[PDB]
Design a protein around this ligand. Structure first.
Ligand code: CLA
Ligand code: CLA
Ligand code: CLA
Ligand code: CLA
Ligand code: CLA
Ligand code: CLA
Ligand code: CLA
Ligand code: CLA
Ligand SMILES: CC1=C(/C=C/C(C)=C/C=C/C(C)=C/C=C/C=C(C)/C=C/C=C(C)/C=C/C2=C(C)CCCC2(C)C)C(C)(C)CCC1
Ligand SMILES: CC1=C(/C=C/C(C)=C/C=C/C(C)=C/C=C/C=C(C)/C=C/C=C(C)/C=C/C2=C(C)CCCC2(C)C)C(C)(C)CCC1
Ligand SMILES: CC1=C(C/C=C(\C)CCC[C@H](C)CCC[C@H](C)CCCC(C)C)C(=O)c2ccccc2C1=O
Lengths: 107, 143, 733, 41, 107, 107, 165
């Protein structure tokens, strides 16, 4: 499945640059981006980002640009939801780009 | 008030059987028994799973974990307004009373229960972990 | 009841669950969290553990030597070292098929063997070894050395030899000795070896134990040394017609200053290596006579630190109180050591490829790739551990009252500025590097490669031209023929240095373009973000606004509950944890850049990198997709070849990485209820409830499964890239 | 329609309007000045 | 059998006119994969005007649905005992929705 | 809810059983073909796991118009078997064979 | 000839790339009619390509061995050899706008701090105030340096820090 499906049938999506299907290659790469971006939310936890955020809020307070709506890290449930959303979006869109770029050319 | 002795003659609610009941922990280490006197027959919710019918009068119920007994305790206290009291039973027959350990429920004062594990300082007045280093076991500065 | 395995922790030995086993496997070397541990006993157990690590290292080198001597072809490799492959060891796999035995029979062997990519062949050939007997003897000697170190570790655990605590806290004599003897006399003896053995063996003359008291390293022995006529030792260097290992164009000098590369090995001369280690030896021996010992002269480091307080207290109390801070803290010294070791491991990597020391290296491409990727990933892990132990210092060893006003407290006083500025740098670099890469991607997609943001790295090119690379025409310092830096070193290193740096066939100061610009800025992104995470964890190790009592919970604790909005991955341990991902990504970018630049150099196709590396579909297609062609065809339904092991390993790492995803995304509480169901199933299944556990099945804890997912992740990352590297480089070359 | 104009003053509607305006401005700039790689004019 | 189904034209703004591929029929656009052309041929459309009026009918029906939501919330909203007539809802969704709908589509 | 433990325990066991006997087959083939033992793989050639039930159903629906659906002129799909329909040179639909690979992927 | 780069006006790979792209577009063009929408579109794209290449070659860009224009980020090398409008001038062209955005945001925040419910003027934008500040913030460098010189740009250490500062 690596060789003869995911590597062989990927020749149409990664060489689509400069052609009509180039947007498919773009959404290939961007979907690979979003999928991996999801891993920032799935592998991590809120308590790190709250402390990073408050060290940033210190810099905003120092320059008198701290917002009235207090910046919080996303909920735990929200972190998992964002992560699964970006994961599904990126993976499904990677598959979408790969499928369509392959099959519009060879089919 | 005095510590009540567990009555084994107390009947149990009408339950049709589950799979969330007792395990080998009951036979080996410990299990728990919760009792309460009901005014009517009410279908309550078992913490193990499924619904059982409590009996009019006293009831008794076995559980493998104290959290189960206190879950049912808050359910019977909040939804049915009862006053249950549970124990800890050991397989050798030793019974240990647990929840209203003074007679009244722990959120209410009793005028004579002793304060334990109370640090009389502020949480920021705790020492640094360098001062409690090499105290034998790994020890928190709260001690 | 109470168990026996965690002898070092009685709280774990009373655990009725499977958590005892894991946490005892993972608290074994945290000696300061042991039961009944004192500081002196801590230092002593660490002394013995260092002895054990030394013994293990030396046994490891002995095993490499032994297997190269036994199952390798070293006597054959020294004959034709540009066309014979290095054999690591032989394979006895009863699972092999006949095609696999037919396929792993490489390098002139009589059976299946593994092609060495560790470079030990080139190293051992450079330092004077030409025989399998030499490596056999070296293996025996290093195993005896390992035995000696093991016996010493047992010995210095004995009552009359158990060192005192102050002996460990004695830093001035340890530093003096580890600078003079361990560093400079070791370099002196290595220069003695080079001069006596390695250089004459490179000049064809065999010099072994049996004749090194009977032959001379120089035709005028030691007369030039004791009469100050030291240039006589740079008399007749090796010519450019020299061939390594024989006496064709040999030369008689032993301490030259030629610079550059040997023309036949494309590696450094052994003669300026000897002069190098000689100068290093003298400098380290003079440096080792600095600190105060039992002889009345020297420095006391506490005095240097306490005297180094600037006026205006721009540093606060200066370094007052830092001597007792570093001396009484093992995590501080460990973090400094890991910082320095990782930085010099990065130096080893960045220099061993451009200035390749070992003969017939730079022509073994897979060896170069493996060595660089290896030492870079080692450096990344070591540098992450540095900050991790800095955090553990802040928690376990830091005293705010003994560091009252010094630089180390001044860090914690302005920690928010450090974290926020590191965050700004990371944010800017990521925004802009990704933006430029996506822009070039879109321009390639829209058929217009001429609209890319191709920024010429003129700063690094200016540096290279200052080093004498005339490709860019800055004509600045060493490329300027009419300069002072050029005219002064012309009787010295310069001729070879410029012949080696203006040659575009070696890795010495490769020419760079906008792809190099973009990927160096990606490297900056990774470094700054990794150190952001790590520095943040170290500084907020003691407290945050979400948790100001974090020091009271230790280094690695799971969380502070769902309260106060949520406190998941709030420890410093989890900051290190999240930084390991960004480190693996940083080093992956680094090694991708290295491997592709060198795959295009070795194939003569640097134009492919100069064109495709400016956009990320170039990196995907022309690097990852293109160079995977032989790897994944290592085995097909038609058959297999020697790359099948690397294909299987590739898929192996792809499995392990993804398996770490399981411990990384799914968290404990789904699995604990699953295991509750399985406990019911086992207790109620007939003929199987007869068999019962002694340790209660529980799910992996939070911190534990974090570590486990990180380990599966790192192992899969590393194995996948190692397989890809070795297979895409060994498949071509 | 004080409440309706308050609604249009909300964060997402104002962001939609402002980014629609910004994107349209950049788009019309890139139409009337195609392929602006450098500042030559 | 020769012309690629396309129904999305891209504006020529920043170079994305390369996405207007040579699909066929003297056309330049994005080759759609939703299968609307086959569905329309199977419906017997054979004219772009019928698609135009179907679009206008769809917009009319959309406005009708939104008017219906506003009505059945703000003007005349049903009681709980109306929703709870699942017997009627099933009888109707089976006779008229899926029965009469299939009958009309058969017609 | 009273016997959810039995439910989930048997479901867990079947998930483990299927994971092993469906993916470890792929791992076994990877290990065999990597070791150079293609006669030890799970293939249509070495160790056949033929999907005989689905093959029988294919043949039962291919022969359906002859016996069990006499008023049908042909089968519902050409995927059961028989002749292919090719339109415009391209294959519209043709019989689909199932072998060991299909067994493994279905599992 | 800064870093060995050839100017794009005399670069050969640059011209080869122009010819390649135009050859691709005319290859697409030959399958269409004289005056059709695809033909006019491809002709317009060819003209845009020709104008783009001409304008990049006119602007004095430096091209590499690949024929692609390479930008010069160094001021001093850009100001000397006439490449300031590549990275250097657009640098300040960006920074004006970016500090303008940031200063308008800062001014809006400081403005809504004083109100009764300051958080509701952040989910619901006070568009009058926002537009007034967005118009009067065009002098953000002068006002920013004047707020900096008075000491009223930076908050004192009333900032919320942590237990170990
Ligand atoms: C972050 C990195 C980055 C950078 C530096 C650039 C830079 C650029 N891109 Mg790339 N791009 C990026 C990321 C990036 N992009 C990403 C991530 C994508 C994928 C979405 C793209 C996709 C992309 C495409 C598809 C195209 C570009 C284009 C461009 C160019 C645009 C020039 C322009 O619009 O002139 C604008 C010039 C100005 C002077 C406007 C400045 C802003 C204001 C208006 C100035 C103020 C004046 C005045 C006071 C305003 C009046 C006030 C008003 C309220 C009335 C420039 C080279 C175009 C191009 O040709 O590139 C060569 C192009 O076609 N980019
Ligand atoms: C001359 C006397 C002397 C010597 C030789 C040593 C030597 C050593 N001591 Mg000892 N020590 C001494 C005096 C001395 N010490 C004194 C006086 C004290 C008390 C005051 C101590 C107290 C002490 C403690 C408490 C410990 C040691 C330890 C060690 C070991 C350091 C670990 C190691 O192997 O890294 C040596 C590594 C290097 C030399 C490499 C660095 C050199 C350069 C910079 C690296 C780059 C080039 C590289 C070498 C190239 C490699 C190429 C190729 C070969 C691969 C080493 C064996 C530690 C140990 O291992 O315990 C057993 C330890 O825990 N020492
Ligand atoms: C610690 C390192 C070390 C050791 C143990 C030796 C040991 C020895 N050297 Mg070597 N040597 C060394 C470093 C070393 N050398 C270095 C660094 C240089 C460069 C200056 C030399 C240069 C050198 C020369 C030129 C000669 C020796 C000689 C000798 C012998 C001493 C005769 C009196 C003896 C075998 C003499 C000899 O007879 O060699 C057998 C001799 O002629 N050595
Ligand atoms: C000279 C180097 C050095 C030294 C002496 C120490 C020493 C110590 N470290 Mg530090 N550390 C180091 C390097 C070092 N570390 C590096 C390089 C890193 C970054 C990777 C860290 C990161 C780190 C953290 C984050 C923590 C420590 C901790 C500790 C302490 C206990 C270690 C422990 O739990 O043992 C037991 C450790 C293990 C059993 C390791 C788990 C297994 C590893 C991941 C290997 C798995 C690989 C796998 C088997 C490969 C299979 C391959 C196969 C599939 C083919 C101890 C003081 C801990 C501590 O002090 O607690 C407060 C702690 O929390 N260290
Ligand atoms: C592809 C995956 C990926 C990406 C993009 C990032 C990105 C980032 N991480 Mg990392 N991270 C990842 C995986 C990833 N991470 C993983 C797997 C882990 C392990 C859990 C971590 C752990 C980690 C830690 C521990 C930290 C970070 C930090 C950061 C930030 C670094 C600053 C930076 O470069 O800003 C540049 C930002 C980007 C490149 C991403 C934004 C993308 C574009 C530019 C935004 C706009 C797109 C578009 C217009 C919007 C469309 C949305 C909508 C309209 C549809 C940045 C957001 C650090 C941080 O927060 O410091 C600031 C930090 O402390 N991350
Ligand atoms: C313009 C006419 C109008 C007006 C003034 C109101 C006014 C009101 N409605 Mg009514 N309503 C209307 C039309 C109207 N409705 C219609 C047409 C429907 C049918 C859908 C409803 C259905 C309805 C329900 C079911 C409810 C209300 C409620 C309300 C109250 C507050 C609603 C609110 O917060 O709106 C602000 C909300 C919006 C602007 C959301 C609009 C969502 C639209 C319909 C869909 C857009 C989706 C979009 C395509 C997604 C794009 C994705 C993006 C990322 C690109 C208020 C009394 C609520 C109420 O009484 O609670 C007390 C309530 O529960 N309304
Ligand atoms: C490649 C990644 C990977 C792998 C191998 C697994 C594996 C598994 N998951 Mg996990 N999971 C993953 C990613 C992965 N998951 C991710 C990314 C998520 C998203 C969060 C999840 C979420 C998740 C949930 C939510 C659940 C699982 C479950 C399962 C199990 C079901 C299959 C099974 O038991 O078959 C048997 C095992 C395998 C197929 C694994 C491969 C082993 C092969 C066959 C070789 C065996 C080696 C053999 C013993 C030789 C040993 C050698 C010796 C030297 C040690 C299994 C342990 C389920 C579970 O535990 O309940 C059943 C479950 O409920 N997983
Ligand atoms: C970021 C650091 C940096 C670096 C490494 C260089 C590097 C260089 N500069 Mg530049 N330069 C920089 C920032 C930098 N510049 C900045 C911020 C300014 C002020 C705007 C200048 C202004 C400048 C001038 C005016 C000149 C250089 C020159 C030079 C060269 C000497 C060398 C290429 C000289 C040059 O033309 O090189 C040939 C020269 O005359 N630089
Ligand atoms: C957390 C912490 C820690 C850790 C930390 C770390 C880890 C750090 C690192 C750091 C690092 C890692 C650093 C690095 C640095 C570097 C440097 C500083 C460099 C320098 C350089 C130079 C100076 C150069 C010079 C020169 C040149 C330029 C070239 C040529 C030659 C010469 C020499 C001239 C500890 C434990 C301590 C504790 C506390 C806190
Ligand atoms: C799935 C889906 C879809 C589609 C769907 C469809 C297309 C459906 C259809 C449906 C239908 C198509 C329906 C129909 C219906 C109809 C009706 C409902 C009618 C009625 C009528 C009536 C009611 C009448 C009556 C009468 C008359 C008038 C005659 C005489 C008698 C009587 C009275 C009876 C889509 C993809 C888009 C999206 C997703 C989902
Ligand atoms: C990155 C990350 C964060 C930090 C993400 C931050 C808090 C929010 C991300 C961006 C927000 C949405 C700001 C974007 C801008 C605002 C919408 C306001 C608009 C202002 C202008 C840009 C228009 C978490 O809080 C988290 C929590 C639990 C598990 C994983 C994670 C996690 O991975």
């Amino acid at each position: 499945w690596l060789r003869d499906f995911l590597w062989a049938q990927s020749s149409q999506v990664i060489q689509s640059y400069g052609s009509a299907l180039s947007a498919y290659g773009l959404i290939f790469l961007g979907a690979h981006f979003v999928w991996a971006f999801s891993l920032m939310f799935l592998f991590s936890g809120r308590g790190y980002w709250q402390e990073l955020i408050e060290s940033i809020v210190w810099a905003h307070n120092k320059l008198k640009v701290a917002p009235a709506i207090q910046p919080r890290a996303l909920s735990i449930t929200q972190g998992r939801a964002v992560g699964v959303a970006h994961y599904l979006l990126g993976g499904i869109a990677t598959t979408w780009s790969f499928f369509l770029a392959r099959i519009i050319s060879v089919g | 008030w005095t510590v009540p002795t567990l009555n084994p003659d107390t009947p149990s609610p009408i339950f049709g059987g589950s799979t969330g009941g007792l395990l080998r922990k009951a036979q080996t280490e410990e299990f728990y028994v919760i009792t309460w006197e009901a005014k009517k027959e009410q279908i309550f919710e078992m913490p193990t799973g499924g619904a059982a019918i409590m009996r009019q009068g006293p009831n008794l119920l076995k559980f493998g974990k104290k959290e189960q007994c206190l879950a049912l305790t808050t359910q019977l206290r909040n939804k049915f307004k009862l006053t249950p009291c549970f124990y800890r039973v050991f397989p050798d027959g030793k019974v240990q009373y647990l929840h209203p350990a003074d007679g009244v429920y722990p959120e209410k004062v009793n005028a004579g229960r002793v304060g334990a594990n109370q640090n009389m300082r502020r949480i920021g007045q705790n020492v640094n972990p360098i001062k409690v280093k090499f105290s034998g076991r790994m020890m928190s500065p709260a001690e | 009841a109470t168990k026996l395995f965690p002898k070092f922790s009685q709280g774990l030995a009373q655990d009725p669950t499977t958590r005892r086993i894991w946490y005892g496997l993972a608290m074994a070397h945290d000696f300061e969290s042991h039961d009944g541990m004192t500081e002196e006993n801590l230092y002593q157990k660490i002394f013995a553990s260092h002895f054990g690590q030394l013994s293990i290292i030396f046994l490891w080198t002995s095993g490499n030597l032994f297997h190269v001597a036994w199952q390798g072809n070293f006597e054959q490799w020294v004959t034709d070292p540009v066309h014979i492959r290095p054999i690591a060891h032989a394979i006895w796999d009863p699972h092999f098929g006949q095609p696999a035995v037919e396929a792993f029979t490489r390098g002139g062997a009589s059976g299946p063997v593994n092609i060495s990519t560790s470079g030990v062949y080139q190293w051992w050939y450079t330092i004077g070894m030409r025989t399998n007997q030499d490596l056999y003897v070296g293996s025996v000697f290093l195993a005896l050395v390992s035995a000696i170190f093991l016996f010493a570790g047992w010995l210095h655990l004995q009552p009359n030899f158990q060192p005192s605590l102050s002996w460990f806290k004695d830093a001035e004599s340890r530093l003096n000795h580890h600078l003079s003897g361990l560093f400079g006399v070791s370099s002196l003896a290595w220069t003695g070896h080079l001069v006596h053995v390695a250089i004459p063996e490179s000049r064809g003359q065999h010099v072994g134990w049996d004749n090194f008291l009977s032959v001379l390293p120089h035709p005028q022995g030691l007369t030039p040394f004791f009469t100050g006529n030291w240039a006589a030792y740079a008399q007749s260097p090796d010519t450019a017609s020299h061939v390594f290992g024989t006496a064709q164009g040999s030369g008689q000098a032993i301490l030259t200053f030629l610079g550059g590369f040997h023309p036949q090995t494309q590696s450094l001369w052994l003669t300026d290596m000897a002069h190098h280690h000689l100068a290093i030896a003298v400098i380290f021996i003079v440096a080792g006579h600095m600190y105060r010992t039992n002889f009345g002269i020297g420095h006391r480091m506490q005095a240097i630190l306490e005297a180094h307080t600037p006026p205006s207290g721009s540093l606060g109390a200066g370094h007052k109180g830092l001597f007792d801070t570093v001396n009484n803290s093992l995590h501080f010294q460990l973090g400094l050591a890991l910082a320095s070791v990782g930085t010099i491991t990065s130096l080893v990597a960045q220099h061993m490829y451009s200035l390749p020391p070992y003969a017939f290296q730079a022509i073994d491409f897979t060896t170069q790739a493996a060595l660089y990727t290896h030492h870079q990933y080692i450096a990344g892990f070591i540098m992450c551990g540095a900050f991790a132990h800095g955090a553990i210092f802040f928690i376990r060893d830091y005293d705010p009252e003994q560091n009252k006003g010094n630089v180390l407290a001044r860090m914690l006083d302005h920690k928010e500025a450090l974290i926020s500025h590191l965050s700004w740098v990371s944010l800017f670099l990521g925004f802009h590097t990704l933006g430029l890469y996506v822009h070039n991607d879109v321009m390639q997609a829209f058929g217009t490669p001429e609209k890319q943001i191709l920024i010429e790295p003129v700063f690094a090119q200016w540096i290279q031209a200052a080093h004498g690379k005339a490709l860019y025409g800055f004509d600045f310092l060493l490329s300027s023929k009419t300069s002072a830096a050029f005219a002064n070193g012309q009787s010295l290193w310069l001729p070879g240095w410029l012949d080696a740096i203006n040659n575009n066939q070696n890795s010495l100061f490769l020419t760079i373009g906008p792809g190099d610009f973009l990927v160096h800025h990606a490297i900056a992104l990774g470094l700054h973000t990794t150190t952001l995470i790590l520095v943040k964890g170290a500084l907020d190790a003691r407290g945050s606004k979400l948790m100001p009592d974090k020091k009271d919970f230790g280094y690695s604790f799971p969380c502070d509950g769902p309260g106060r909005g949520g406190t998941c991955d709030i420890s410093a341990y989890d900051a290190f944890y999240l930084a390991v991902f960004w480190m693996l990504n940083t080093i992956g970018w680094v090694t991708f850049y290295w491997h592709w630049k060198h795959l295009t150099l070795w194939q003569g196709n640097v134009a492919q990198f100069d064109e495709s590396s400016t956009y990320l579909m170039g990196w995907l297609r022309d690097y990852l997709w293109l160079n995977s062609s032989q790897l994944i065809n290592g085995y097909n339904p038609f058959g297999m070849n020697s790359l099948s092991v690397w294909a299987w390993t590739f898929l192996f790492g792809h499995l392990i990485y993804a398996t770490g995803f399981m411990f990384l995304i799914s968290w404990r509480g789904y699995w604990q209820e699953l295991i509750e169901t399985l406990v019911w199933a086992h207790e109620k299944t007939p003929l199987a409830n007869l068999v019962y556990w002694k340790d209660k099945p529980v799910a992996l804890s939070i911190v534990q499964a974090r570590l486990v997912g990180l380990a599966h992740f790192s192992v899969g990352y590393i194995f996948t890239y190692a397989a890809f590297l070795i297979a895409s480089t060994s498949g071509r070359f | 329609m004080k409440d309706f104009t308050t609604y249009l003053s909300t964060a997402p509607v104002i962001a939609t309007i402002w980014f629609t305006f910004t994107a349209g401005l950049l788009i019309e700039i890139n139409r009337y000045f195609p392929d602006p790689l450098v500042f030559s004019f | 059998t020769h012309i690629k189904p396309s129904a999305q034209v891209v504006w020529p703004i920043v170079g994305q006119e390369i996405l207007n591929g040579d699909v066929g029929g003297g056309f330049q656009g994005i080759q759609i994969t939703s299968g609307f052309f086959q569905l329309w041929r199977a419906s017997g459309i054979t004219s772009e005007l019928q698609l135009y009026t179907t679009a206008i009918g769809g917009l009319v029906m959309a406005a009708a649905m939104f008017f219906a939501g506003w009505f059945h919330y703000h003007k005349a909203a049903p009681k709980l005992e109306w929703f709870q007539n699942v017997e009627s809802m099933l009888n109707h969704h089976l006779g008229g929705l899926l029965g009469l709908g299939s009958l009309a589509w058969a017609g | 809810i009273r016997h959810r433990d039995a439910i989930i325990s048997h479901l867990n066991w079947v998930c483990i059983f299927l994971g092993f006997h469906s993916f470890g087959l792929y791992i076994h083939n990877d290990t065999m073909s990597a070791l150079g033992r293609p006669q030890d793989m799970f293939s249509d050639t070495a160790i056949q796991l033929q999907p005989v039930f689905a093959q029988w159903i294919q043949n039962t629906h291919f022969l359906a118009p002859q016996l069990t659906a006499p008023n049908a002129l042909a089968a519902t799909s050409l995927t059961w078997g028989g002749d292919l329909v090719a339109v415009g040179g391209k294959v519209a639909m043709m019989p689909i064979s199932l072998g060991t690979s299909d067994f493994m992927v279905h599992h | 000839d800064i870093a060995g780069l050839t100017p794009c006006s005399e670069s050969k790979a640059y011209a080869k790339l122009e010819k390649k792209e135009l050859k691709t577009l005319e290859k697409r063009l030959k399958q269409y009619e004289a005056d059709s929408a695809p033909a006019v579109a491809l002709k317009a794209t060819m003209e845009r390509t020709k104008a783009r290449f001409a304008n990049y070659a006119k602007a004095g860009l430096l091209c590499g061995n690949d024929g692609l224009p390479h930008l010069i980020a160094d001021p001093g090398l850009a100001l000397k050899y006439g490449h300031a409008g590549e990275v250097f001038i657009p640098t300040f062209g960006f920074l004006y706008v970016a500090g303008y955005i940031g200063y308008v945001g800062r001014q809006y925040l400081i403005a809504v701090k004083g109100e009764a419910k300051p958080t509701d003027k952040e989910i619901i934008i006070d568009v009058p105030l926002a537009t007034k500040l967005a118009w009067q913030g065009a002098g953000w460098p002068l006002a920013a340096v004047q707020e900096l010189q008075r000491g009223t740009l930076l908050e004192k250490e009333e900032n919320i820090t942590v237990s170990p500062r």
